[PDB]
Structure 1
């Protein structure tokens, strides 16, 4: 089988900058090389066929290059909607084979998160579990420290985090941190708080509620 190697699987780049994604074949493939873009939602789109030919409706800032074993996809100048994983595909022989992918991280200017906290609903509590949610909205970069404090006691091991993909318009992330407790543990404490540390904040931001003020 022809192996397609995309050695650089994670690539960062700035808005406006030139980006180069490279693909090498284990043996020559005589320019029978396509490029696909996979958006974060799983939608796949053909960009370039036969090394160099742009598909209909693909921006002129995408171009394909190379011959033999070595191929490149170049983005003349990077737009926010280019956040995606890029895959090469040889059709020189069967079975068709795919590069391992290159995921684009887009560098933009620092934006601090705006922070929100949500108490558990009575509808959840009646079933014995309390989920406390902290949201960090529309920040850059990805690096964020989220600490949970219950009546001012720092928490450990009782929270899970999840992060969106970079937004296609403003190249920001959003993150949720969920603190999970038993109803019985939820009810032993008054103040629930998440404290957020980020490059865009001159000092950490704390959002809190009092259980039984809501």
Structure 2
């Protein structure tokens, strides 16, 4: 076999909104359907069993519905701690099968990042590589442009970004941009600048240091 389909794998919702996650089975599963919540840290919890029975300790904002092939998990009023991936699972037949999951993207009010720049440590430099790090802390939405400038020359192809999962309390993201240079290239330049563009910023913010 029974295929469980969660057609919508990425679902946007606003805090306080009603949210509906849908699952369809390839054949009737006679209400033998459970829902699980997986947090960004990989922890899994049972929410709903046998279509509509709330697991003890689960908030009453969670409910389940459906029959035959078509099942839904409904969050009556979305809270920031609900950021997670939701999976359905049938136990009508062996093998037990799971839907592909639905990850929430929580919509909150715009917040600009606070920006920080870190030079490489001597401890790293002595081994022949320099990492320069730019941090964008606690912002929304996810879209941000981070441009490196070295002695006022725009850089390309020598940085990598990483982004946290949305925070369970404030629904924000944080992002690192890491510029990687050889020691020799690092010591050839003076000014290292991180330029940040974001919806919450009325003009771009630059953080910089002099070597």
Give the TM-score taking structure 2 as reference length.
Answer: 1.00
User: Pairwise mapping of residues 23-34 of structure 1 onto structure 2 (< 5 A)?
Assistant: 23-34=23-34
Please state how far the C-alpha of 1:176 moved relative to its aligned partner.
0.1
Deviations 1:175-214 (A, max 9, x none): 0000000000000000000000000000000000000xxx
- Post-superposition Cα deviations, 1:50-82, rounded to whole Å, max 9, x if no partner, equal 000000000000000000000000000000000
Tell me how far 1:141 sits from its aligned partner: 0.1
Q: Determine helix, strand or coil for the equivalent of 1:186.
A: helix
- 3-state SS in 1 of match to 2:131: strand
Q: What is residue 72 of structure 2 aligned with on the other side?
A: 72
| Secondary structure class of the residue paired with 2:184 | helix
In 2, the alpha carbon distance for the partners of 1:107 and 1:48 equals: 25
Structure 2 CA distance for aligned equivalents of residues 46 and 58 of structure 1? 9
Please give the alpha-carbon distance, in whole angstroms, between the structure 2 residues aligned to 1:60 and 1:125: 54
TM superposition shift of 1:88: 0.1
d(CA) in 2 for partners of 1:82, 1:96: 25
Residues 79-138 of structure 1 show CA distances to partners (whole Å, capped at 9, x for unaligned) of 000000000000000000000000000000000000000000000000000000000000
- Name the count of aligned residue pairs: 211
Distance in 1, Cα, partners of 2:144 & 2:27: 44
Q: Give the distance between the partners of 2:73 and 2:86, measured in 1 at CA.
A: 9
> Which residue is equivalent to 2:9?
9
Structure 1 equivalent of residue 60 of structure 2? 60
- For 1:176 and 1:18, the matched residues in 2 are separated by 33
- Where do 5+ consecutive residues of structure 2 fail to align? none
CA distance in structure 1 between the partners assigned to 2:110 and 2:209 by the alignment = 28
- Cα deviation, 1:29-52, whole Å, max 9, x if unaligned, reads 000000000000000000000000
Query: Which ranges of 4 or more aligned residues in structure 1 deviate by more than 4 Å?
Result: none
Q: For residue 124 of structure 2, give the secondary structure of its aligned residue in structure 1.
A: helix
Distance 1:70 1:179 in 2: 48
CA distance in 1, matches of 2:69, 2:54: 20
Taking the aligned partners of 1:125 and 1:104, their CA distance within structure 2 comes to 41
Q: What is the CA–CA distance in structure 1 between the aligned matches of 2:197 and 2:209, rounded to whole Å?
A: 19
**What do residues 136-157 of structure 1 show as CA deviations (whole Å, max 9, x unaligned)?**
0000000000000000000000
State the TM-score, normalizing by the size of structure 1: 0.99
- Secondary structure of 1:72 counterpart: strand
Cα drift, residue 159 of structure 1: 0.1
Q: Cα RMSD over matched residues?
A: 0.2
